[PDB]
Amino acid sequence: GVCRAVARRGVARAVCRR
Numbered sequence: 001g002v003c004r005a006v007a008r009r010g011v012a013r014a015v016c017r018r
Contacts, residue, residue: 003016 001016001018003014005012005014007013
């Protein structure tokens with residue numbers, strides 16, 4: 001249920017976990 005959108009200068013990582 002937690003969507004953590006990490007971005008490392010263009011590198012978007014949207015992980016929706018729990």
